Amino acid sequence: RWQVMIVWQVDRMRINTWKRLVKHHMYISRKAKDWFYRHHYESTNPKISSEVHIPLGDAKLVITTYWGLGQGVSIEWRKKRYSTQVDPDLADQLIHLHYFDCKQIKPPLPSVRKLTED
Amino acid sequence: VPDQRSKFENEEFFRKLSRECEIKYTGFRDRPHEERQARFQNACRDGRSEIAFVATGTNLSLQFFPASWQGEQRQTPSREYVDLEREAGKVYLKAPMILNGVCVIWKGWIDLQRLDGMGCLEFDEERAQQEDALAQQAFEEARRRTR
Amino acid sequence: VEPMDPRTFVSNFNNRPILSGLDTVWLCCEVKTKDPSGPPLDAKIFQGKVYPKAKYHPEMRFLRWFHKWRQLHHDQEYKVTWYVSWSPCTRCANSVATFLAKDPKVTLTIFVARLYYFWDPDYQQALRILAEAGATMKIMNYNEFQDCWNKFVDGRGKPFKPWNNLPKHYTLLQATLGELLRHLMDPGTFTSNFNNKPWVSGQHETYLCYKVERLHNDTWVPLNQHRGFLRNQAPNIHGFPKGRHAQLCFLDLIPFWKLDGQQYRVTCFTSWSPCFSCAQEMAKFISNNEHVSLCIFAARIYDDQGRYQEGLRTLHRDGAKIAMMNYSEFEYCWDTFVDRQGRPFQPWDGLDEHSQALSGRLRAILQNQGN
RNA sequence: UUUUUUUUUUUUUUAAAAAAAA
RNA sequence: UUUUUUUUAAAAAAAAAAAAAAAAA
Ligand SMILES: [Zn+2]
Ligand SMILES: [Zn+2]
């Protein structure tokens, strides 16, 4: 089959800032203590750099990060085997209005529209 | 379906996504073109490759993945297809995707010699009730609240 | 020579494949003529930023310094040596390879401590382009580290003390450079050792050809990024390196890929049979790792009164699929892991006779357990 | 370069015990 | 009331030693 995924195309620099900020917020700070970072090897897909899983209640946002395409992003929304693609504005809204609080800090907060700067 | 169609005429990204965009294939650009067309024919005829379709705004790209890569054989998304026998000299792409609160089928055509083509979106009312879980109400409640 | 950071080079040039918390890519080059017996002309150590910037990388430092040197020096053939802490970067590799293709005189030898980003294709293709440009890239051993400490480290007379787990990481990194750079064994060593005419002269050192599949929901599909020949290391070349017998590096390199819970099999085209000091580790390894099955094709059965029968029995009983090398498997080993350059596979005298004789020996030794 | 641990001490706090002195 | 010894746990840095670093943890 030809299972369909949307992809936001972005260079290695912005994707590496995205990875740096998300692991800095899970591990160095305690803002994202409930977030998951599924590694590249746990993904059986050959074109996945990472799977940042953001548990939103009983649901879970998925930010899959890709390889060898530059690189690509894809945002899902999974709750009991039900997927839903999500544009970066809605993913930003769900992240900021479920997890974090409300200005520039030396680590900027993980925002998928700053990822998809273009 | 009615409020789904009302918000379907309300999304800001949908104005760009369903304006019959000029889709192009961004694959192996530095190589010859003829071999790009030939590789498009092999990729649309094989079972292990990906194909990417990019709009004019160089930000959004639909990518088709083989179902064995994820290792999940789901029966209900089976309507996605790459048609060549339907019409001569033109390849059709069909993909049912659940975008935000709505389930929309992406339909496009792309010439084998132009490698470019037309893409658009279309509501299909079957997937509104075929989703057994139907967490669109929960999605709605999550997306409307604001701190 | 101006020597920079005496002490930080111990855990900054650290032979360990995965090592985070770093900011500096180091580069410790030296320039020479075509004759290496002569003294070096100059040897300057450079320090380029890692993720900081691509324009101010150590490779760009070297590119700029070579430019400023060669406008003030005579143009001739140069044999430059590097010792870099990481592997080159995508942009750096794709510019350094252009710089090597621009001047045929300059010949690099990029020695790396750790490989930078070996698990994504965007870096792997860049490293393959750099290696195809004409720079022989080798993982640093003890001797290159001793050269780096002797030249480019402000030592106070103290000698180079190798850290713990240097040679295990050396073979763990060499067998993925050999798989990421499509390194293929020569035809000469293949027709020297892999042929199954019986041991009367030569053929002292065993070889390997591993191959990884996936067992997907449809069928088996091979991965192409885990394939190479993992020859067993020389036994204690100066005492400190561990001399690993029975392609120990394969079993030790098993977990290095971070194998998924997805079950599959790994093919091991060994040019011998796993000995008693190498098969019990295999049986334990296939015991505690249920997901990975390990199929084995052997050229010649190891028989030196080493009680190999019990090890082979407990290797087969746990779930390893041992067979013996026929012309199909020999053809695959010549087709995939040997740089045949287009030449077809040539057989020897008594291919099927020796194959069926050794397989009958395998039947008479393996299958007689419990009658 | 940094997190998680094991085993030993230097000085302090607290508690218990043995001995000597006023 | 003062002095010597042993022990139960902690604290500032140190040397003895290990594991995870999938890469600005
Ligand atoms: Zn670099
Ligand atoms: Zn052995």
Numbering used by the authors:
A (entry chain B): 4 to 72, 82 to 114, 158 to 173
B (entry chain C): 5 to 151
C (entry chain A): 9 to 142, 147 to 383
Text taken from the publication that reported this structure:
Human APOBEC3G (A3G) is a virus restriction factor that inhibits HIV-1 replication and triggers lethal hypermutation on viral reverse transcripts. HIV-1 viral infectivity factor (Vif) breaches this host A3G immunity by hijacking a cellular E3 ubiquitin ligase complex to target A3G for ubiquitination and degradation. A3G contains two cytidine deaminase (CD) domains with complementary roles in HIV restriction, the N-terminal noncatalytic CD1, and the C-terminal catalytic CD2 domains. In this process, Vif hijacks host Cullin-5 (CUL5) RING E3 ubiquitin ligase complex containing Elongin B/Elonging C (ELOB/ELOC) adaptor and zinc finger RING-box protein 2 (RBX2).
While full-length hA3G and other primate A3Gs are prone to aggregation, we have previously shown that an engineered A3G from rhesus macaque (rA3G) has improved solubility and stability. Our assay confirmed that K128D single substitution in rA3G rendered the protein highly sensitive to HIV-1 Vif–mediated degradation in a proteasome-dependent manner, while D128K in hA3G rendered the protein highly resistant. The population of a protein complex containing A3G and Vif/CBF-β/ELOB/ELOC (VCBC) subcomplex was more dominant in the cryo-EM micrographs than the full complex, likely because of partial dissociation of the CUL5/RBX2 components during the sample vitrification process. The cryo-EM map exhibited a density representing a double-stranded RNA of up to 22 base pairs protruding from the A3G-Vif boundary perpendicularly to the Vif-CD1-CD2 plane. A long protruding A-form RNA duplex is branched above the cavity formed between A3G-CD1 and Vif. Among the four nucleotides, the R+1 base plays a pivotal role in the complex assembly anchoring Vif, A3G-CD1, and A3G-CD2. Direct protein-protein interaction was observed between the A3G-CD1 loop7-α4 patch containing -128DPD130- motif and Vif. The species-specific Vif sensitivity–determining residue D128 of A3G stabilizes this interaction by forming a hydrogen bond with the N1 amine of the indole ring of W70. There is no observed contact between Vif and RNA strand A. Vif H43 and Y44 play dual roles in RNA and A3G recognition, facilitating its unique three-way interaction. In the structure in complex with Vif E3-ligase, rA3G CD2 undergoes a rotation of nearly 180° around CD1 compared to the apo structures, resulting in the two domains facing opposite directions.
